[PDB]
Amino acid sequence: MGSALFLVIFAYLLGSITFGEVIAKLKGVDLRNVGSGNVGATNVTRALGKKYGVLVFFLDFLKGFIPALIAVKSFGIDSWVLTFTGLASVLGHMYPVFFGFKGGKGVATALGVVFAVSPSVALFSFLVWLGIFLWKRYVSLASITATISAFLFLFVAGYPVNVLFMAIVIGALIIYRHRENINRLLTGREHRF
Ligand SMILES: CCCCCCC/C=C\CCCCCC(=O)OC[C@@H](O)CO
Ligand SMILES: CCCCCCC/C=C\CCCCCC(=O)OC[C@@H](O)CO
Ligand SMILES: CCCCCCC/C=C\CCCCCC(=O)OC[C@@H](O)CO
Ligand SMILES: CCCCCCC/C=C\CCCCCC(=O)OC[C@@H](O)CO
Ligand SMILES: CCCCCCC/C=C\CCCCCC(=O)OC[C@@H](O)CO
Ligand SMILES: CCCCCCC/C=C\CCCCCC(=O)OC[C@@H](O)CO
Ligand SMILES: CCCCCCC/C=C\CCCCCC(=O)OC[C@@H](O)CO
Ligand SMILES: CCCCCCCCCCCCCCCC(=O)OP(=O)(O)O
Ligand SMILES: CCCCCCCCCCCCCCCC(=O)OP(=O)(O)O
Ligand SMILES: [K+]
Ligand SMILES: [K+]
C-alpha cells in the first residue's frame, strides 16, 4: 500500500544524505583525500576532530532511527514495512542516490534502526562495539563483532522473523562493505587507533 511505499522511499532518500560529506565540504576538506577516504564518522573524526565525528555519528544514526520509528509506530515491530524501511535507510547510506555522494558502511545508520526497535538491544550492541574497540583499537573489528551481536541479541530477546530478516540482511551488507578491512585484519595490517 501507498503509505508503506512512501515511507520506504523516504527512508532511502534520507539515508542517501551521507552527512560526513555535508560537514567535510563545509570546511573545504576533500574527505576522499584525508585518512582512509571514507565518509563515515570514523574518517570525519580522523580528519576534522572527535567533536565532528560525534556529530556525524548522531546525524547518520538519526536517518536510520527516524524512519524506523515511524514504521514501528505506524505499522508495528512485527510489520515487514519496518523490515524494508530499515533496509532502505542503510542501503541509502551505502548506495546514495545523489550523484555526488559516495556511500559509507552503514554502521551508525543501522544502529539507529535497531534503537527504534529496542533501545535495550541497541545499547547492548553499542557496548559490544565499545568493548571490542577499547580492547584492540580497530573500528572495523568492533563494527563487525557488534553487528553480529545485534542479531544474536534480537534473537534471544524474542523479536520476530521480520526483524531477524532485517538484521541478517543489514548485517550481511555491513560485513560486505568491510571486505577490505577484513583482509587487513587477517594480516595484522588494519589501521589502529
Ligand atoms: C529505488 C526506489 C527505492 C524503493 C523501492 C521500492 C520499495 C519496496 C517495497 C515497499 C513496500 C513494502 C511493503 C511491505 C508489506 O508487505 O507491507 C504490508 C502492507 O502495508 C503493504 O501493502
Ligand atoms: C544506542 C546509542 C548509544 C550511543 C551513546 C553515546 C554516543 C556517543 C558517541 C558515539 C560515537 C563513538 C564514540 C567512540 C569513543 O568515544 O571512542 C573513544 C576512543 O577514542 C578511546 O577513548
Ligand atoms: C554476544 C557478546 C559478544 C561479545 C564479543 C565476544 C566475541 C569474541 C571475540 C570478538 C572478536 C575477537 C577477535 C580477536 C582477534 O584475533 O582479532 C585479530 C587480532 O589480530 C587483533 O589483535
Ligand atoms: C553467556 C552469558 C550470557 C549471555 C546472554 C544469553 C541470554 C541472556 C539473556 C536473555 C534474556 C532475554 C529477556 C527478554 C525476553 O526474552 O523477553 C521475551 C519477552 O520480551 C517477549 O515480550
Ligand atoms: C556476561 C553476560 C551478561 C548478560 C546480562 C543479561 C541481562 C540483560 C537483560 C535482562 C532482561 C530483562 C527483561 C526485559 C524484558 O522483560 O523486557 C520486555 C518484556 O518482558 C515486556 O513484556
Ligand atoms: C550482501 C548480502 C545481501 C543479501 C540480500 C538477500 C535478500 C534475500 C531475500 C529477500 C526475501 C524477501 C522476503 C519478503 C517477505 O517475506 O515479505 C513478507 C510478506 O509476508 C509481507 O506481507
Ligand atoms: C561474536 C562473533 C564475532 C565475530 C568477529 C569476526 C571478525 C572477522 C574478521 C577478523 C579476523 C581477525 C584476524 C585473524 C587473526 O589474526 O587470527 C589470529 C587469532 O587467532 C588471534 O586471536
Ligand atoms: C545491526 C547493526 C548493529 C550495529 C552495532 C554497532 C554500532 C556501533 C556504532 C558506533 C560506531 C559508529 C562509528 C562508525 C561509523 C562510520 O565510521 O561509518 P558508517 O559505517 O556509518 O559509514
Ligand atoms: C564487551 C562486552 C559486552 C557484553 C554484553 C553482552 C550481554 C548481552 C545480553 C543479552 C541481552 C539482550 C536482551 C535485551 C532485553 C530485552 O528484551 O529488552 P526490551 O527490548 O524488551 O527492552
Ligand atoms: K576503511
Ligand atoms: K551516488
From Swiss-Prot:
Reaction catalysis annotation: an acyl phosphate + sn-glycerol 3-phosphate = a 1-acyl-sn-glycero-3-phosphate + phosphate
Compartment(s) where it occurs, according to its Swiss-Prot or TrEMBL record: Cell inner membrane
InterPro entries: G3P_acylTferase_PlsY
Pfam family for this entry, one: G3P_acyltransf
Topology in membrane: Multi-pass membrane protein
TM ranges: 4-24, 52-72, 81-101, 113-133, 150-170
Top-level taxon: Bacteria
Quaternary context: Probably interacts with PlsX.
Function text: Catalyzes the transfer of an acyl group from acyl-phosphate (acyl-PO(4)) to glycerol-3-phosphate (G3P) to form lysophosphatidic acid (LPA). This enzyme utilizes acyl-phosphate as fatty acyl donor, but not acyl-CoA or acyl-ACP.
Similarity comment: family membership: Belongs to the PlsY family.
Name this polypeptide is given: Glycerol-3-phosphate acyltransferase
Organism: Aquifex aeolicus (strain VF5)
